[PDB]
Symmetry: C7
Subunit: 262 residues, 7 copies
């Protein structure tokens, strides 16, 4: 019935609620101002949202410490409990944070961009988009692959499309009795008559290996990246036709058999 204490306790609860409200307002205002200030300085929008969220949650933590102190909770208790809750949220969000930073780095440095054909860690396909946590790519046969961004930046990135010009390599195996000069001359005429092969680049035509059943010639020629596959197919069909017309044999696997009738 002695209300002098009950009024003080209710007034402390009201002061705590008022501190909570004013602190949430001030946190939203200051975080929005810092976000607009970072966006005006051409900071990346994701980095700006991340730092603004950190500012907002820090001001809210100051507010919670002040209010819970008004209702008698000690500062060490609030700091320990907020640290435990933040550690739990951080353990939950750790992988997403790694993927988020990786996606910012991928958009910032552009090791690849949408439309390029890439090989990310052994999967290969055309990049479709880099998103907040993962990259989507479409394989040559139309499957969709989703890869987390952190796994992408942690590994090698092979970009098939970045270079305008790329090299074909042919390995032609001919019979051991084939005339070497005739083979080199025919392959040279074939790659010389192909307009899509760049003549200012290397145009290797060399005997390369003495194989088990055949001698292997290597042909290396450069082309624009959009012509590479068609040049490979056209040159291969021309090699087949010209070697057939010239009598140069493509050998079947060979075997000397030393007969013994026991």
């Amino acid at each position: 019935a002695n209300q002098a204490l009950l009024l003080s306790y209710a007034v402390n609860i009201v002061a705590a609620l008022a501190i909570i409200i004013v602190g949430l307002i001030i946190a939203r205002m200051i975080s929005n101002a810092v976000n607009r200030l970072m966006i005006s300085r051409k900071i990346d929008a994701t980095v700006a949202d991340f730092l603004s969220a950190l500012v907002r949650y820090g001001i809210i933590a100051f507010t919670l410490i002040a209010a819970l102190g008004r209702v008698g909770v000690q500062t060490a208790s609030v700091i320990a409990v907020l640290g435990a809750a933040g550690l739990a949220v951080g353990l939950a969000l750790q992988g997403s944070l790694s993927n988020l930073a990786a996606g910012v780095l991928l958009v910032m440095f552009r090791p690849f961009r949408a439309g390029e054909y890439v090989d990310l860690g052994g999967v290969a396909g055309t990049v479709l988009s880099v998103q907040i946590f993962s990259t989507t790519m479409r394989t040559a046969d139309g499957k969709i692959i989703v890869i987390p961004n952190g796994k992408i930046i942690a590994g090698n990135i092979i970009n098939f499309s970045r270079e305008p010009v790329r090299r074909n390599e042919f390995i032609i195996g001919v019979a051991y009795d084939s005339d070497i000069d005739q083979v080199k001359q025919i392959l040279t005429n074939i790659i010389q008559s192909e307009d899509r092969i760049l003549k200012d680049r290397e145009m290797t035509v060399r005997l390369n290996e003495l194989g088990a059943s055949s001698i292997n010639f290597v042909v290396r020629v450069w082309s624009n990246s959009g012509d590479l596959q068609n040049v490979y197919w056209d040159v291969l069909e021309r090699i087949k036709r010209e070697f057939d017309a010239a009598g140069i044999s493509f050998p079947y696997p060979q075997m000397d058999v030393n007969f013994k009738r026991v």
Copy 2:
């Protein structure tokens, strides 16, 4: 017999029990209110339950600190003991927390959905459901596979079903003496007469490799994802029948044998 101290000790125990009861009530009320507030803001229900549990356990920690302080335990002692107990519970729950966050991300971004055929880290099957800690899938032969969610989001996700259209590839090997133009013409007629092959897509028919015993042709054609397997089977049987009717040989493995009767 001097009860002035015993009454003070019993009154402190009663005050501690009252603080415990009122704190549990306030924790349940505030956590339920924060949960309803998050659900009204369209926060995901699992994220809302997680943050509400954090709020409830934090208020209960404040309550325990106040009560145990009433019975003479120091604030540093309660904080150290609650931190040890929370570290033990967190070590127990760490993997479940990772799987829980991963399941929220899988439901939120939908790299796959129920009914799609996917390949998650080398196992492949039709997704049945994403659950709180793990995803269930059924393989093509009817086995059930359970995969933890964190393992899924940490790896590549190959979605066979997301794209409406997908590509078949045939590798046909024919004898070296086969006429190349006749082979290409027959394969072109076969894929031209198949209505389920999309004519506005690529329809590759090229000589692709000079193999050991055969020259390999590659055929690449696109179809709707529901037609892919049936188109593969029908085109393959037609290739067999047409090549038999045209006299184009499918070669057995070849071997030149250079006989020597020693």
Copy 3:
């Protein structure tokens, strides 16, 4: 000989021993009450025992801090020493704690149950029991395998027994000159006359591959999981007998030999 201090020191030692005794009693009582309260709420018994042990050891830590403070040890010293001892015990018990939580999750979500045939990380067998730290399984040839629970929940779980119906697949290779329609008709009659094959499921019989020495047909049929192996054996023996009666050849490996007598 001035005993006024010695009596105070002995009385402090007696007060410390009394605090130890009363604290152990209160810890046992409160932990038993919390355990019964959790068991009444249908909490899993292992989770209840774990949380009750945490409550008991925390109350004992408060008791030790109070008693050692009575004998003059400072609160920071007791907290540091108990933290070191708890860190040592936690390093000793870390793997057991992971296995314990994993076993609770396995019993709770039942990815598999006793009697089911499963494949856990490359070992396969019939589950016998999930125990507190490890699962026992018996392989098909009668070996016993013990697997820690944490290793099980961290990996893929392939359950062969969960689905009532499962699919057989046959790969039959026949000679290239075999009549395709006759082969498909014979295989269709065989799987049509088998009562244990489910006729409402897929019943694939397709030419599948042009192999090196043979054309391979694929047969896919569904059966109840208890009939799968017997259906495989019966259908395979019938395929052998019917193909022998019809004259359809199973080819030996083939080789074209181009003879050259040098």
Copy 4:
């Protein structure tokens, strides 16, 4: 020459030495009492020695803090230095602690016991003893293998000896022209006349595969674990003899050769 301070300093040094001596005595006494109390409660002796060592070193830490405080070292300094020394000793002893806990678990749950034949992580042999840090096993050819206990409990444990009964499997390949009923009848008579094969268990004799050069029959029969190898050898020799007597051929690798004299 004013000795009033020098006497106080010497008396503080003497008080520190006395606190050290009395604390070492009390630590040894209390740790021995706690050890006897744990051994009386049937706690495992290694666990009891570990917890007793923790109690002894904790009491010695309290003693060192009190004594070094008597000679003017601050409590925070002693706690930081003892924490650094304990962290160094713990880094040195971490792997031994893991092996010690693993050895306690191995002795407690007996996944294997001495004399059993086991496969621990790809090495296999007869267990000789589980020791404090590592297990010794002897391989079939007499090599000794020492494995750390933590590596053992972290992996799969395959116990060949735990089950009284185990299964043999034979894969017999016979010529394609062999009569299937005659082969099954001969194998059935062989396993029917073998007394060490358990007749109440499965006795599979089925055609299992159409191989490249042969049709493979599978025979599966159960025996007592001590009879398994002898039953395998006896049944295999009987299969060889009976198939020779019946004219059933064991095929050499086959090859159809399509001759072409070019």
Copy 5:
């Protein structure tokens, strides 16, 4: 209406804003001065920017602590909140920090430089540039590979271009009946007449292996790194021509066939 407190609160807010402004100014000035001082001492520019950023953010942290103390936030609260925000930013930036330090080390010690052909962890190509977080290289066929710097310095670095002189190795297989002295003499004449082979280096020509179908000779010769591939091709073609002119046979795979007409 009693404004004596409201004026004090507004004056504290103004003092906090003034401390913020002056602290940001002083932080920018001191960090710029420390950066110019480090650049004058020939510290690497990236290391200087990193340490200057650390100095600037530390002075800003002191400023925030002072200002938030002026508005009543406690020093422990500001330190805990800034530590949580810095831990979040550090978890986001950890991989970038590792790549940044690795790039500084790569530029500083030059294990490779732009234009050199290197093999970094199994990918090989010509280095194009070392950048702040990753290295770019172009493969021999024109693909671009991006590798994070930390992955590069953590692994082996094989530099094909650092040494002016490099060794070719030929493995020539000849028939078993070939005269060994004639083979060694022909190979010696070939490598003796090649001007691009360094005569002061090793010029090995030895029988090296008795293979299955042939005896293998090893030839090892050194050349300038720019001549290595051309010397390999020229010597190989000369070996083919000279062995053909001398009648030394390159053997096909051999097989003794013990005929048995059963």
Copy 6:
């Protein structure tokens, strides 16, 4: 010119230097005494040196705290700086500490000793010495291998030399038409006449496998470890000679060829 303060500051510097000197002396004395006390108790010398170094550095830390407090540095500052320096030294020394503890364990438990032939993680050789951080072994062909001690104790240790007796195993393949009883009788006579084979051990001679071209017999016999290789060589040469004298064939790889002249 008012020297009353300057004298106090110089006297504090002198007191700090005196505390440093006396503390270094006391640290050396106490650490030497503790080292001699541990060596007298038969503690291993490396463990004694490690604990003595910990005692010495801890006393030096107390000395530094007292002296730097005399010159006005606060205890928290000295503890934080010494903790940072000790963390840096510990990060530098962590791997060496692991190897040091592992070497103590290897010398203490003797899984192997100098002169024994062992297999440590896939490398095999004769142990030469266990040193403070690594073990040296010489391979059979004379290469020296250095292995860090921690890598050794973390893995399996296969000791070829610990057991006096070891088992040879022969796999002899004979023609399918060979008489089984004659083969077993000849192998039994061979191993019966060899004095270095232990007759009280197992002397297995069983048909073991029906191979592709041969039936394989297994022979298992025990010998003293010093006789194992010589017994293997002598028994193998005797098997060759006796099977040649008895007409038992060692088969060449077999092939049934079904000729077809197309």
Copy 7:
């Protein structure tokens, strides 16, 4: 206009700058003295530079704490900010610190030295130098390999050059009909007439294996490390010549062909 406070603030700033200057001077002096003292005690120069840098930065930290305290920053704030900056620098320098300690250990214990041929983790070459962070080696074909020191000390180190004497091993396969005594006698005469083979070492010449097409003899002989390759080549050529002169056949791969004209 009341300058009594402004003068006090300026005097505190001047006192902070003076403390900074005097502290930098004292830090440089004390660190140089400790470095000279360690170098005089034959401490390794890198270890001395590391510990001197730690001493210098610790004294600078004490100086910064005192100065920033003079300008009103609290000790806890300076310690937290310096700890964050030191944690950032330590995360940047962690891998370099591991490589630095590893390089000190490599120079100190000399598992290898410059000029020796070693195999470090699967790459092999002649060591050129051990540097502060990485080791350089040149491969046999002249490529340069850079390996971080920590990766080297963490793995096996195979030293080909440390032992003066090393063993060659020959595996000679001869025809099954070859006389065993004649083969052993010829190989024994060959290795007996070779002066560079050490006659006091093992000189094994034993039949070793009954292979598919040949019986394999093993020859093992020791030589000085500089003679090993030349002895291998000379003995191999002599084996070829002597076996040709004696009529001992080197077999081609064998095949029994059981002809069947179907």
